[PDB]
Symmetry: C2
Subunit: 58 residues, 2 copies
C-alpha cells in the first residue's frame, strides 16, 4: 500500500488493538484515546470493552 495519507495510520492501529483484545491481553493500551472527533469516540469504545474483559477475568 502507500502511506501518503494519514487515514491508514488510525485504521492499522485499531486493527492491532482488536487482535490484542481477542488474545485476552488486558495490558495493551488503546491509541488515539486523546482524540476529540469520531475517531476518538471509537477508540474510547474499544477501551470500554477491554475494561469489561478484565472484570470478567477477575
Amino acid at each position: 500500500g502507500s502511506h501518503m495519507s494519514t487515514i491508514t495510520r488510525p485504521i492499522i492501529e485499531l486493527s492491532n488493538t482488536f487482535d490484542k483484545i481477542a488474545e485476552g491481553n488486558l495490558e495493551a493500551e488503546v491509541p488515539h484515546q486523546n482524540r476529540a472527533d469520531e475517531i476518538g469516540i471509537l477508540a474510547k469504545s474499544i477501551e470500554r470493552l477491554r475494561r469489561s474483559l478484565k472484570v470478567a477475568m477477575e
Copy 2:
C-alpha cells in the same frame, strides 16, 4: 442536515455493536460486513472479537 449525511451512520452503528459486545451478547450481528473499504475491514475485526467471546463462554 447532519442526519442526512451518511458519515455518521457507520460510526453510530459501530458504537451500538460495541455496547452489545460488552454486555455479553453473542447473538447481535455486525453491520457493514459486506463492505470492501477500510470500514468493511474494521467491521470484520469486531466480528472476530465477538466470535472469540463465544468460544470463551462455551
